[PDB]
Design an enzyme around this catalytic site. Structure first.
Site, mmCIF file in Angstrom:
data_model
loop_
_atom_site.group_PDB
_atom_site.id
_atom_site.type_symbol
_atom_site.label_atom_id
_atom_site.label_comp_id
_atom_site.label_asym_id
_atom_site.label_seq_id
_atom_site.Cartn_x
_atom_site.Cartn_y
_atom_site.Cartn_z
ATOM 1 N N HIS A 199 18.949 -30.128 -2.551
ATOM 2 C CA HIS A 199 19.494 -30.559 -1.270
ATOM 3 C C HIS A 199 21.019 -30.564 -1.300
ATOM 4 C CE1 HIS A 199 18.390 -34.483 -3.456
ATOM 5 N NE2 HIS A 199 19.650 -34.207 -3.736
ATOM 6 N N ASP B 283 25.598 -34.331 -6.350
ATOM 7 C CA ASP B 283 24.879 -34.185 -7.609
ATOM 8 C C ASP B 283 24.108 -32.870 -7.647
ATOM 9 O OD1 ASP B 283 22.332 -34.812 -6.126
ATOM 10 O OD2 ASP B 283 23.285 -36.790 -6.022
ATOM 11 N N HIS C 94 15.149 -37.623 0.759
ATOM 12 C CA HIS C 94 16.503 -37.913 0.302
ATOM 13 C C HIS C 94 17.536 -37.196 1.166
ATOM 14 C CE1 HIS C 94 19.460 -39.249 -2.692
ATOM 15 N NE2 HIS C 94 20.026 -38.066 -2.539
#
Ligand SMILES: [Zn+2]
Ligand SMILES: [Zn+2]
Length: 227
Positions: free
Chosen positions: A86, A90, A149
């Protein structure tokens, strides 16, 4: 003459650690910094013949560099491919370095749409919900159980070792909650995880967004906090 007897790969500093899951896959964990604290971001290193691969880049280009200037010699393979789950610091955070040397960041059409929204680069985005990838003797199939997320949050699945990369979408055993849901959908999160335990139940090892590999227990962990 003088050598140690270890398996993982931890640099002198000890910021980047790569644990060998078996004999053809590792778990690169780049340690960032939460302003005074540490933010270890686990991953997945694929030992292929067509080139090295790492699931989700490093926090910042500064870290990625130290990760590419160590695995390129340790694994004896140069990194030229990376799977994006995504749009997050990170994940494509260090994409700037992956799209500068020659690393193709495989992702979904959506992943390359919201990536720029934050100010990141534009990955392949030639992926989809359920597709099959091939990195030379290395098969990698993605999965999109829904929103969680992020708007395109997905989970990398490896039918070659029954390994799964729940990523940030799936909390780790050392977690107490999801934390930060501004760019996430808690309304569909619990719905996405339930899909990773009902469809992709068969998993030999699951790698969360932070920590280390475990099992399907990580899936139910998310709902145990996002409930
Ligand atoms: Zn994330
Ligand atoms: Zn994360």
């Amino acid at each position: 003459s003088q050598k140690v007897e270890k398996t993982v790969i931890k640099n002198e500093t000890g910021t980047i650690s790569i644990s060998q899951l078996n004999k053809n896959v590792w778990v690169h964990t780049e340690l960032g910094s939460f302003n005074g604290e540490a933010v270890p971001s686990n991953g997945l290193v694929l030992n292929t013949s067509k080139g090295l691969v790492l699931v989700d880049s490093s926090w910042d280009d500064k870290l990625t560099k130290e990760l590419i200037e160590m695995v390129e010699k340790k694994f004896q393979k140069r990194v030229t491919d990376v799977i994006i789950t995504h749009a997050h610091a990170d994940r494509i955070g260090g994409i700037k370095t992956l799209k500068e040397r020659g690393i193709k960041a495989h992702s979904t059409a959506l992943t390359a749409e919201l990536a720029k929204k934050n100010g990141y680069e534009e990955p392949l985005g030639d992926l989809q919900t359920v597709t099959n990838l091939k990195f030379g003797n290395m098969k990698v199939e993605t999965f999109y159980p829904g929103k969680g997320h992020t708007e395109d949050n997905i989970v990398v699945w490896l039918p070659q070792y029954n390994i799964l990369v729940g990523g940030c979408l799936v909390k780790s055993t050392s977690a107490k909650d999801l934390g930060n849901v501004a760019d996430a959908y808690v309304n569909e999160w619990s719905t996405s995880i339930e899909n990773v335990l009902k469809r992709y139940r068969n998993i030999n090892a699951v790698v969360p967004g932070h920590g280390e590999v475990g099992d399907k227990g990580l899936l139910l962990h998310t709902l145990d906090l996002l409930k």
